Amino acid sequence: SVKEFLAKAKEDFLKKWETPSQNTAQLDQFDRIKTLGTGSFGRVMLVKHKESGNHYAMKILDKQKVVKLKQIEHTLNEKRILQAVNFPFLVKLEFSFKDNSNLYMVMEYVAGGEMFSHLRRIGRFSEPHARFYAAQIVLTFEYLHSLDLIYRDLKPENLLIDQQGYIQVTDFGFAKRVKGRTWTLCGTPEYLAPEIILSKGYNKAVDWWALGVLIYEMAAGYPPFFADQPIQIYEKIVSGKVRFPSHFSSDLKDLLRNLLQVDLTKRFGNLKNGVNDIKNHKWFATTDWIAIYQRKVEAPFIPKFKGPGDTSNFDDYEEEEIRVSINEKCGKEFTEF
């Protein structure tokens, strides 16, 4: 049963949450090959583990940059949580370690590319295609929230397509274990729930809002709220108005009115039934939730792979020198990493 699965899930998580793994590799055990993507405090690179021959994705975070931006707690959150979770649609952390200059998180390499790249190239996903991805997000959110985790950065850029055409969620940078409400203004302008923007406390319902934006963007090819400047996006989010493309089915539009619901008391995922409000919605009638979890449903598309270490599904980025100082930078701040 779901209840018993979540109970075993919680216990596995709590053991790792209480006793995180640390310093389980070092930099010279990897050949650094190519940058796969970028963010605020550095780089995700394709790497090759010399001893096993495996390729991995190494996330490199500059300690000094983390501190200057006041992201210490978020980064410690990111590593503590990602090393503790286990779910089919969450990227596997394999090794973590740090040196004088950087923090390192070595993940399984997800070769299919970002959902972002495929979505922009194709324009938009058909409803059955979007549903397939959305279903994996729904189950993943069920898992994460049961652990008192809030994810807080859902977007196509943080979603990777694996070799079976399934979703792998990456970037736990804003993830946080919190039982009450929380207040940090974080996320992505387009995906922000009204309550985040309005500097109210918020809770896990912001993730359900973010799901509505994601589904809308997959199915339309553009997000429900866009404009050239962040401030203009926020006005649109807050206003309580969304227009749907005429090609959206009635079930889709109905699902979206409930997800993109400004009133927290009426938002799907946040009512007494919780996630079942969503799982049992008409839009998801054809969804086999168990089969999705076991990865037995055939993907709407399997990405092209020209073999091992292939980066054809990722954009090119300017490579830069990886410099390690001879002096330990910010040792005290990152003790538990």
Binding site: G39, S40, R120, G123, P189, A220, A227
Partner: peptide, 19 residues
């Protein structure tokens, strides 16, 4: 069309997280 408006807008590329 709103698609044409999106495509002409400055936010069609990868979007940075904010904090």
């Amino acid at each position: 069309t709103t698609y044409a408006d999106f495509i002409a807008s400055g936010r069609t590329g990868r979007r940075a997280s904010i904090h």
